[PDB]
Coordinates of C-alpha atoms in Angstrom, one line a residue:
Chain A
X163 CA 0.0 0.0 0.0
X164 CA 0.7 3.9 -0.4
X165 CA 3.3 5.4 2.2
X166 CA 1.8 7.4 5.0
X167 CA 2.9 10.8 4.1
X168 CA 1.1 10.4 0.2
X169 CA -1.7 8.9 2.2
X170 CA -1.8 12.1 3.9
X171 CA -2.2 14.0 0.9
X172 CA -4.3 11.5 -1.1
X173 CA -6.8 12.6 1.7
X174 CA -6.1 16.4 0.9
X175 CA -8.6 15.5 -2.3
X176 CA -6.2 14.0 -4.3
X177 CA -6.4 10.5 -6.8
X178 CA -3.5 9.4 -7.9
X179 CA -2.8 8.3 -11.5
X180 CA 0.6 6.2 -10.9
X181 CA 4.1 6.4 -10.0
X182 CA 7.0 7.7 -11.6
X183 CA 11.0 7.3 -11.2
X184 CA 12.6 10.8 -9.8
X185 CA 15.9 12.2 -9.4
X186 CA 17.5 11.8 -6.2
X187 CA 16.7 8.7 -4.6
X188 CA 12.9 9.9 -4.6
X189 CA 9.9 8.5 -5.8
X190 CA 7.2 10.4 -7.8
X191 CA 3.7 9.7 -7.9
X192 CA 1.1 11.6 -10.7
X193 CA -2.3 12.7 -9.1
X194 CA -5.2 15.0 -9.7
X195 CA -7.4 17.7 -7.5
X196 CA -10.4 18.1 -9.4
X197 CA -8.9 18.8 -12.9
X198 CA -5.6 19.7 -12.3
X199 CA -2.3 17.4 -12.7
X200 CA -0.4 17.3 -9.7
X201 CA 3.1 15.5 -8.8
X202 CA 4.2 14.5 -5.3
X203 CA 7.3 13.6 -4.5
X204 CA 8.6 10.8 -1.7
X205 CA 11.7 11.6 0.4
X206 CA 14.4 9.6 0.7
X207 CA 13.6 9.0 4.6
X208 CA 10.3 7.6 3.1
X209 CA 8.9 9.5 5.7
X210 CA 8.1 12.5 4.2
X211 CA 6.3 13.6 0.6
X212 CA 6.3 17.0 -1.3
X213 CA 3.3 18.2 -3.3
X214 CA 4.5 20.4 -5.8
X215 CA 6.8 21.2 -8.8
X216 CA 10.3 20.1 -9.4
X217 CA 12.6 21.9 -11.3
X218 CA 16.4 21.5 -13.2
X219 CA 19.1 23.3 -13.6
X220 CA 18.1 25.0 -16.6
X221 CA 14.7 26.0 -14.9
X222 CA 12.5 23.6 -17.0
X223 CA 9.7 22.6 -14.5
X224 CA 9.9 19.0 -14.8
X225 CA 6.4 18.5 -12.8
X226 CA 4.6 20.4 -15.8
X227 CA 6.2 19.1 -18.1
X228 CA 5.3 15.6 -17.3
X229 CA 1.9 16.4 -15.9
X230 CA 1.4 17.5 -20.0
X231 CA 2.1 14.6 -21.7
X232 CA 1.0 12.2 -19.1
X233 CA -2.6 14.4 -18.6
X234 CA -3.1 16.6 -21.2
X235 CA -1.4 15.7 -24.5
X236 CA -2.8 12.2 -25.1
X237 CA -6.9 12.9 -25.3
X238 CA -6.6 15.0 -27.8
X239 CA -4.0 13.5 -30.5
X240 CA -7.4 11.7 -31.8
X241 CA -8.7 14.8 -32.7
X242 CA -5.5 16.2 -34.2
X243 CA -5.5 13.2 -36.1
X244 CA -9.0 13.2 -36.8
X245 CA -9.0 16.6 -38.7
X246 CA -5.6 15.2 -40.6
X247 CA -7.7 12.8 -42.2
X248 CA -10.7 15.1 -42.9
X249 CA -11.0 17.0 -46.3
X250 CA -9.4 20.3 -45.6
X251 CA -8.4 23.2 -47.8
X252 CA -5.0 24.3 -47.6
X253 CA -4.2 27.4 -47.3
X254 CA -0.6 28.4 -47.7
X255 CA 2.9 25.8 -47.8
X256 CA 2.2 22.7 -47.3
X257 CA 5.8 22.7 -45.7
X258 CA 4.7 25.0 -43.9
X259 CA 5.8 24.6 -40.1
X260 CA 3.1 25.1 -38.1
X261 CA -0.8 23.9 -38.3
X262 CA -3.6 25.5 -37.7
X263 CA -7.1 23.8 -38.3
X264 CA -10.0 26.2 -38.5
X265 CA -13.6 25.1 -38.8
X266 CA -14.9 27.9 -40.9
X267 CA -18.9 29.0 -42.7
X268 CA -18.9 30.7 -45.6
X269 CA -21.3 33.3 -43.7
X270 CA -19.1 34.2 -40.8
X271 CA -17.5 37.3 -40.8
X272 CA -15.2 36.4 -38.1
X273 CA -13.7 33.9 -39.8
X274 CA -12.8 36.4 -42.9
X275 CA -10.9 38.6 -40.4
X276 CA -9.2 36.0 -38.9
X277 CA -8.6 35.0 -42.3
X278 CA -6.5 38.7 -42.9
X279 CA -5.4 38.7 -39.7
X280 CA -3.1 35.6 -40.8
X281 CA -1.7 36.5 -44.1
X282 CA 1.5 37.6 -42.7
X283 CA 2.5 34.2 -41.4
X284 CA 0.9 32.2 -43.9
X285 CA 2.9 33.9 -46.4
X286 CA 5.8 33.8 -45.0
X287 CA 6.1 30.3 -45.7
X288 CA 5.2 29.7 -41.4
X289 CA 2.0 28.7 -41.2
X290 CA -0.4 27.0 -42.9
X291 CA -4.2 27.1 -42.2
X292 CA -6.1 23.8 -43.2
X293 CA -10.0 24.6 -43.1
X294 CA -12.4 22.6 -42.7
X295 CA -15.9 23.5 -44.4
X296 CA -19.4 23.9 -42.6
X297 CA -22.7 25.1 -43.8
X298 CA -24.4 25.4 -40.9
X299 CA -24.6 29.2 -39.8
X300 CA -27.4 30.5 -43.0
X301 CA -30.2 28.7 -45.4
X302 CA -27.6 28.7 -48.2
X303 CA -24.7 28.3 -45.7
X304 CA -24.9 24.3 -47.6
X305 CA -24.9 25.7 -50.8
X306 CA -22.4 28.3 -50.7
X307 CA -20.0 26.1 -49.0
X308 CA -20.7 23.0 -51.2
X309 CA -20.1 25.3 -54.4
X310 CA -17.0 26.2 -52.8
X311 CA -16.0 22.4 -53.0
X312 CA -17.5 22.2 -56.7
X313 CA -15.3 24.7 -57.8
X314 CA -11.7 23.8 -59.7
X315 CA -9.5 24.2 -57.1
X316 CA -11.7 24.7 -53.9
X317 CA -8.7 26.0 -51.6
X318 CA -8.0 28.9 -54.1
X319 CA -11.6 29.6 -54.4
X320 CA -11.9 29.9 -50.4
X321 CA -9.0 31.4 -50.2
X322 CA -10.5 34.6 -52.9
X323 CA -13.6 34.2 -50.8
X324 CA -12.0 35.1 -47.7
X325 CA -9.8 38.0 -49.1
X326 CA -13.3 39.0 -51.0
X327 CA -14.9 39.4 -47.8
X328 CA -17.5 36.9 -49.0
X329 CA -18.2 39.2 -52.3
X330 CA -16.4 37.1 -54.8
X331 CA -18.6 35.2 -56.9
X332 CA -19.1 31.6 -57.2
X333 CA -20.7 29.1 -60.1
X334 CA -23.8 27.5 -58.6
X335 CA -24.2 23.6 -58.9
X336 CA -27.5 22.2 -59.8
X337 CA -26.8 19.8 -56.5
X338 CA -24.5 19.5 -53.5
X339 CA -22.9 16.1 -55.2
X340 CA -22.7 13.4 -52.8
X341 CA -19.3 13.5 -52.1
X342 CA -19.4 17.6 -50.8
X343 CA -22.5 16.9 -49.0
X344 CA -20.1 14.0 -47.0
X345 CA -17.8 16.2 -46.6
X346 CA -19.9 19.1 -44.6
X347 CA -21.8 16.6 -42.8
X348 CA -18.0 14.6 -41.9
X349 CA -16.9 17.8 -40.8
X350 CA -20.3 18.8 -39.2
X351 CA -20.0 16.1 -37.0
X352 CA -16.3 16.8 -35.8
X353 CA -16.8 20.2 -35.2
X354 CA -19.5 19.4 -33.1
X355 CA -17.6 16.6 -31.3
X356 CA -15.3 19.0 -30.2
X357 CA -17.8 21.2 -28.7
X358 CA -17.4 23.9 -31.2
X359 CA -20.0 25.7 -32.0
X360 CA -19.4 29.9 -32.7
X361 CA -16.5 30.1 -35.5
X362 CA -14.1 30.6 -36.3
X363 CA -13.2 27.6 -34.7
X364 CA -9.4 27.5 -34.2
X365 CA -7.5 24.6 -33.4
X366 CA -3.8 24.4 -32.8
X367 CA -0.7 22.6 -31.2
X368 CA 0.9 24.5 -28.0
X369 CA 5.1 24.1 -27.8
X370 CA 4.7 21.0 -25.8
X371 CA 2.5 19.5 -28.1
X372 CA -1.5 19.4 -26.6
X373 CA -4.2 20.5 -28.5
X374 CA -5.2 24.2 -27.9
X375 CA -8.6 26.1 -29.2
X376 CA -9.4 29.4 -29.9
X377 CA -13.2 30.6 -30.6
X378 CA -13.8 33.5 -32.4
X379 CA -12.0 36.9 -33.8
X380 CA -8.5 36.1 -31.9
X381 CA -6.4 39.5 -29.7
X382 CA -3.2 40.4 -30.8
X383 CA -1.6 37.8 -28.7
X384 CA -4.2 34.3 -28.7
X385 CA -3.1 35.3 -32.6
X386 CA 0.9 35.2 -32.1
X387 CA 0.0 32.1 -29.8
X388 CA -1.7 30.7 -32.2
X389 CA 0.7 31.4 -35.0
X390 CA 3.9 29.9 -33.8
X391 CA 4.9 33.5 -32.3
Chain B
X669 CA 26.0 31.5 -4.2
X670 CA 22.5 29.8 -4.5
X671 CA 22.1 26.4 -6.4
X672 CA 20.9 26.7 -9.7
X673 CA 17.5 24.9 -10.0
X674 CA 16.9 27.4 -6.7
X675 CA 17.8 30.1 -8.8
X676 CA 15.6 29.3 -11.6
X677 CA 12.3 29.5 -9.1
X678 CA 14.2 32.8 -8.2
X679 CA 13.7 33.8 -11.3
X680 CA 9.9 32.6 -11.3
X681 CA 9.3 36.0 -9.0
X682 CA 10.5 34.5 -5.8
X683 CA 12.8 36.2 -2.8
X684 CA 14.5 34.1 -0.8
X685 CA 14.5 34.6 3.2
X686 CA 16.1 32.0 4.4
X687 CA 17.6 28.7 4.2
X688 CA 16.3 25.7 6.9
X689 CA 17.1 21.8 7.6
X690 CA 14.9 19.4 5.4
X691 CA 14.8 15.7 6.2
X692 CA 16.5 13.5 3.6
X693 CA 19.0 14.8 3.2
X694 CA 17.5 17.7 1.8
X695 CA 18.1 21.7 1.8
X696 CA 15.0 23.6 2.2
X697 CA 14.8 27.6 1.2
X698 CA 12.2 30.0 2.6
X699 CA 10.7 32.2 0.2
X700 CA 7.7 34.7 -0.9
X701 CA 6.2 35.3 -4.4
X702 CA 4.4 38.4 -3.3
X703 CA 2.6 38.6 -0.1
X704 CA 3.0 34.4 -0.2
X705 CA 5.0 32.3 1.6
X706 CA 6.5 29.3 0.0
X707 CA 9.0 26.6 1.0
X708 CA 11.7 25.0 -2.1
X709 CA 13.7 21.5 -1.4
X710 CA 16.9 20.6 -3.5
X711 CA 17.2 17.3 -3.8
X712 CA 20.0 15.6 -2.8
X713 CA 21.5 14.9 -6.2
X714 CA 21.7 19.0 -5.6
X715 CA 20.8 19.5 -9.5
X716 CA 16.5 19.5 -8.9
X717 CA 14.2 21.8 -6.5
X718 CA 10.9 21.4 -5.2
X719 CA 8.6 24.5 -5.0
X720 CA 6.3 23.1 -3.1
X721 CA 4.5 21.6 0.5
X722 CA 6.1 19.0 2.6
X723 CA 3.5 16.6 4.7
X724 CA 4.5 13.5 7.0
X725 CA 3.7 10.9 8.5
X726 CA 0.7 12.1 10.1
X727 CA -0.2 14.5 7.8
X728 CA 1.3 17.6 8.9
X729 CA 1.7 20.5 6.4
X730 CA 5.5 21.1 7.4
X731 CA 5.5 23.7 4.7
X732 CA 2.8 25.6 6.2
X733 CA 3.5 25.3 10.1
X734 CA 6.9 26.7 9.1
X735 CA 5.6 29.5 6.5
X736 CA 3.3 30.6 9.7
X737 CA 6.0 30.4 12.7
X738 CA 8.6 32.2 10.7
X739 CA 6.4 35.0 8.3
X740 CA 3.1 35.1 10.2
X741 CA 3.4 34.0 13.8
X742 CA 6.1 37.3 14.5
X743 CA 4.5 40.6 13.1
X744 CA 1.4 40.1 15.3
X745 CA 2.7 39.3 18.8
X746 CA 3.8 43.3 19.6
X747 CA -0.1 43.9 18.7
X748 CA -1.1 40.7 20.5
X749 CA 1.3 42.1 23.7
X750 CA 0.1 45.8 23.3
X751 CA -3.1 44.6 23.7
X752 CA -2.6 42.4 27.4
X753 CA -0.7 45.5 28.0
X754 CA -3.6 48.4 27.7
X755 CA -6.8 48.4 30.7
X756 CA -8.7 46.3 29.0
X757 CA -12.1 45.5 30.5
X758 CA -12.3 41.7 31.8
X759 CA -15.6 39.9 30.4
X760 CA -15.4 36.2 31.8
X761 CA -13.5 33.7 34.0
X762 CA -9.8 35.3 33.9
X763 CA -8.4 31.7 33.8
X764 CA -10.2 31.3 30.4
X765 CA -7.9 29.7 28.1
X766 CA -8.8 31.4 24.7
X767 CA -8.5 35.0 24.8
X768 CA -10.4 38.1 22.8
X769 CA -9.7 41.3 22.4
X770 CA -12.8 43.4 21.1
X771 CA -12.5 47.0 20.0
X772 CA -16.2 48.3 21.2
X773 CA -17.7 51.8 21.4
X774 CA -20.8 52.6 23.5
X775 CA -23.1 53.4 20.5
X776 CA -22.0 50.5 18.3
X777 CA -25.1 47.8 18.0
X778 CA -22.8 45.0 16.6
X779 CA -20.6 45.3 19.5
X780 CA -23.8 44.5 21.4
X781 CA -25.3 41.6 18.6
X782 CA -21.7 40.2 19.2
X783 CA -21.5 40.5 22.7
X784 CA -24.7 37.9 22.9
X785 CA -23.7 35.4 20.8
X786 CA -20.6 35.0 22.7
X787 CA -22.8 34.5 26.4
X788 CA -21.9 30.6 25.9
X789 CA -18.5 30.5 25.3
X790 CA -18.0 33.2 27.9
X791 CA -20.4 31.4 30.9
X792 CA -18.8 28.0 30.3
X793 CA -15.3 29.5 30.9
X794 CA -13.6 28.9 27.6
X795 CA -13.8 32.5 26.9
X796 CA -12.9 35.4 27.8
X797 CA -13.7 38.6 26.5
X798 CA -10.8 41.8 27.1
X799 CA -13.0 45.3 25.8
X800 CA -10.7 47.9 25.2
X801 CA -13.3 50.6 24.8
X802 CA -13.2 53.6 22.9
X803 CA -15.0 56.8 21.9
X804 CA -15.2 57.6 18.4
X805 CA -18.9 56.7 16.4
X806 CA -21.0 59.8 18.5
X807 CA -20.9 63.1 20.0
X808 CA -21.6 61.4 23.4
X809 CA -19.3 58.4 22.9
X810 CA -16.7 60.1 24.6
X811 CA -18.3 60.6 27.4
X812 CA -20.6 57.4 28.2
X813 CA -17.5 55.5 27.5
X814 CA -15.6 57.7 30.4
X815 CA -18.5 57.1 32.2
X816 CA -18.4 53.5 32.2
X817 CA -14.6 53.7 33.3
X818 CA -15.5 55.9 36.0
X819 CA -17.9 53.5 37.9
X820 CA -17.2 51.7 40.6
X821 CA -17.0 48.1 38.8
X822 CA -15.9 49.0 34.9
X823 CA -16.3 45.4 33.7
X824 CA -19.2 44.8 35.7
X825 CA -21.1 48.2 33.9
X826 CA -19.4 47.7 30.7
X827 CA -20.9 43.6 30.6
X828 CA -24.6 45.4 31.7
X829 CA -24.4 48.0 29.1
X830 CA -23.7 45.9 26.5
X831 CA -26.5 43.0 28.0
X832 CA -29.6 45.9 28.4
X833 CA -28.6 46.9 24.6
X834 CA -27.0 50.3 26.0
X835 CA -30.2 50.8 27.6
X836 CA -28.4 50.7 30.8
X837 CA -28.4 54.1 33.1
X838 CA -25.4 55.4 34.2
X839 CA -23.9 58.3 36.6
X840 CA -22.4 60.7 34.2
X841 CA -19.5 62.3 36.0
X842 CA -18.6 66.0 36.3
X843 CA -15.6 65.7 33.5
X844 CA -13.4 62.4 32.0
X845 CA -10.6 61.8 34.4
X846 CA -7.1 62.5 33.2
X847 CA -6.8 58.6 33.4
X848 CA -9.8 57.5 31.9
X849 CA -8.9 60.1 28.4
X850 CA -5.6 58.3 28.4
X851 CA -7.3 55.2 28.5
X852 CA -9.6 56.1 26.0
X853 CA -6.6 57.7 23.8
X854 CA -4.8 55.5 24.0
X855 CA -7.1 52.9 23.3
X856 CA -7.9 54.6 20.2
X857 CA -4.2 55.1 19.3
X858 CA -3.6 51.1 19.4
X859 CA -6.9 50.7 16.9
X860 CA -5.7 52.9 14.5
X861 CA -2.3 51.4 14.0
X862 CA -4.4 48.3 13.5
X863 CA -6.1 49.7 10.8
X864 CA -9.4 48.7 13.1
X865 CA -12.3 51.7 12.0
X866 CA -15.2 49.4 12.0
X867 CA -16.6 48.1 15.2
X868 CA -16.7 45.1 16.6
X869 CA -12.8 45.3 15.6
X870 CA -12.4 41.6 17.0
X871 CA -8.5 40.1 17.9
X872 CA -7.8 36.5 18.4
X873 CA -5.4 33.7 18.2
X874 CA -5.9 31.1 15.5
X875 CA -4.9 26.9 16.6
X876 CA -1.2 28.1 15.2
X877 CA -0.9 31.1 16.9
X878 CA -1.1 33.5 14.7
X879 CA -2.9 37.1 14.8
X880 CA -6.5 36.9 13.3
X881 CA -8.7 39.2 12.8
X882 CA -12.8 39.7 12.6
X883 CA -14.5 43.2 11.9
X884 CA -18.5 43.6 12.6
X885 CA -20.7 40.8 13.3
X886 CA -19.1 37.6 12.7
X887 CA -21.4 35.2 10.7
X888 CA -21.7 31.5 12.7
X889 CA -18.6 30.0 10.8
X890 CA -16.3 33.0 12.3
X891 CA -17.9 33.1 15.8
X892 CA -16.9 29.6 16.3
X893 CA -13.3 30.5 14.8
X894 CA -13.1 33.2 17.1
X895 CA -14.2 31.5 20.2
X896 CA -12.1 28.2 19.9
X897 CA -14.3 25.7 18.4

């Protein structure tokens, strides 16, 4: 069973996850108050037990870093993954660095300024911005964004669409074809899975790798965040 | 000079006061980020810290008995001492193990609400109650407070006033003694450097002795606080 002085603690509200090898002769153990990640640390003497954050020399907190990958990175790799494998239109190098997913209508002005608000680091060769296609926000929200996947080259097309400010003009399909009306409906279902609802709907990876959101028309700095900055 | 996984907390926004004996081998650092006080152990191997709080056995926070004995405890024990040392009125058995001071003016009705729900406490002998009275809230404070200094049994008027709501007669003497206004100022010199205006301005000492503090009418939570339970 659990030594004494993590018992102690354990009864401080905490559930531990499992343990962990530490420097020094100690023994870590990975917990949780409520929603937040926590790391204890054993002494030596086995007698005593330190709730909080270790640190190295070079100042990286080793307690957060840990309580990231172990707690927070994993749940939403899926989800990175999933929007991978979704029909997105690239906008930008396809080198490009850093990934940003954005769930976009083509009746949402947010997502047009957001859309400017980007050019800088798109075109620079930075960032690329894969969207993902909705039709959910007007009555012809379906068939603007499905003639937007009709079109030649869809990306280009959003792309003018977006630096139109929703004025450039599009070629009407007699139908959504079956494979555009998948593709809103696939995407549909993802945004909604990931409890995204107002757009534009910004996903992104932090440094360390989790899976970051941003909702709406980001501030100067959710937008250098977001863009690698 | 300091070890450098100490220094790199340093440079979280910590000061360091102090440095103490951990078990395990371990160094342990005193510090504050802002008003906060917060305890760091290197770890033997000397190249990780621990920002964080130490429990043992029993389930002590070591981390906060110490953070309360070293920057709590102290600042509050001249005020605690300059209180015992003013003419404080005596309200309850004087071998009463928890002691209260209570700043109270004659005209003040929550220094009469409090006075009642303390009765228990007080009768059973648990508590005692030091006044150190003061004339400031109305033109006839002054002088109903000298008033209540100048009869026979001080206490003994002071524990009727505040039991007959103020409603209590009293001999109003000719002029406040020379030693009553001294009382009285410098009763009123003490609350000020306490930064005490509103009254009840109520003084105790919490389980770790450390200098609490309750203003107006304590809600049940606080009353019990205050009066040891």
């Amino acid at each position: 069973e659990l030594p004494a002085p993590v018992k102690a603690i354990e009864k401080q509200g905490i559930t531990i996850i499992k343990t962990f090898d530490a420097p020094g002769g100690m023994k870590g153990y990975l917990g949780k108050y409520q929603d937040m990640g926590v790391t204890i640390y054993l002494t030596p003497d086995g007698k005593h037990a330190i709730s909080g954050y270790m640190y190295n020399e070079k100042g990286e907190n080793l307690s957060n870093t840990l309580i990231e990958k172990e707690i927070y990175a994993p749940a939403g790799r899926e989800m990175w993954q999933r929007m991978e494998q979704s029909h997105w239109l690239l906008d930008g190098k396809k080198d490009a660095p850093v990934i940003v997913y954005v769930f976009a209508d083509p009746f949402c002005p947010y997502c047009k300024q957001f859309w400017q608000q980007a050019r800088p680091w798109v075109d620079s060769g930075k960032v690329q911005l894969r969207t993902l296609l909705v039709g959910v926000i007007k009555p012809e929200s379906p068939a603007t964004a499905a003639a937007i996947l009709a079109s030649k080259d869809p990306a280009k097309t959003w792309q003018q669409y977006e630096a139109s400010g929703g004025k450039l003009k599009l070629n009407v399909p007699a139908n959504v074809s079956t494979e555009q009306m998948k593709v809103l409906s696939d995407n549909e279902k993802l945004m909604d899975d990931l409890g995204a609802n107002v757009m534009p709907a910004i996903y992104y990876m932090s440094k360390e790798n989790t899976l970051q959101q941003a909702v709406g028309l980001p501030d100067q700095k959710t937008l250098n965040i977001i863009m690698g900055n």
